[PDB]
């Protein structure tokens, strides 16, 4: 099969960082492609419970777990490296 990014169109490799908005569009995207860090990519990946939405869905509100956008997943991450949460999840609790 193949897998066309999301953003760039062109094919989203197992050897490349990527996520899958799963919960809409079913499509992946390259991390690079979408703005979101190292960090939020890593913690993200790892919770099974999380999901991510990309930026096209979100601006239609397409589909309308915990959802993270780019920008909440971002910042859920620098709070867990900050010391600040404990966790993505945690800190999505807290801020919603
Ligand atoms: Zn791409
Ligand atoms: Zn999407």
Redesign the pocket.
Known sequence: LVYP?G????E?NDDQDAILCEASCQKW??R??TGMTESAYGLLTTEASAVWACDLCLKTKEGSVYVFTTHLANTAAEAVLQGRADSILAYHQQNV
């Open positions: 990014c953003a760039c169109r062109s989203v995207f390259h690079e492609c």
